[PDB]
Copies of this chain bind each other. A is one copy, B any other.
């Protein structure tokens, strides 16, 4: 009944949307969950909503020392990580003409740099046979107006799942990317989507759950599109 019974999960991007829905689903499947976020107020609200088996940890995953501190807390409280959902992400639209160095740095710092170190520093805590899930995007395989840096960053994320699959296979750690389409969160995409609607965060959490759980035990390095068919037709 409980597909993550007694597993320990860390979820970055934990206060908002997908992170939050995933946290609830993970708890419902009997996991212990750390949610991670920059803003303490929202994190505590998120933990309140989740209600049980959850620790909120304030961290800016773009800052190495914030990561060290998060992992020190995770080690003290629960020892080991079974499931890491690296889901922090931020989108700002700018066309090629409009790109400034600050815009470039913001996007790649949060989407790629932050991710790399999030995963690097989780390594000593990750259990052999554990599962790592990266949040890429349908943007990583599309040519969307003004999504230059975001799409490019998200393609870099999908690439990391491949590389990390190779590098961590000795320890049997699976790494897979999830690529959401339009998810209803805090009509153009809905028109082009075969399912004819935006996804619910619950539906994304459910896909992440697959990758987190034993059901995906022979699935490695993939990009799982969860986009109602958008990129598939």
A→B interface (CB under 8 Å) = 1, 64, 95-97, 99, 101, 104, 108, 112-113, 116-117, 119-120, 123, 140-149, 151-169, 172, 174, 181, 194-196, 199-200, 203-204, 206-207, 209-210, 214-222, 224-229, 232-233
Contacts and interface: CB of A to CB of B under 8 A. Distances in A.
Q: Is the interface of A mostly helix, strand, loop or mixed?
A: helix
A1 B2 CA distance: 7
A218 B194 contact: no
B172 A195 contact: yes
Contacts of A224: 219, 222, 224
Given A207-B219, A215-B209, A228-B220, A143 B164 contact: yes
Given A108-B108, A162-B233, A232-B162, A219 B215 contact: no
7 contacts: A97-B123, A99-B116, A152-B160, A161-B232, A174-B195, A218-B228, A222-B229
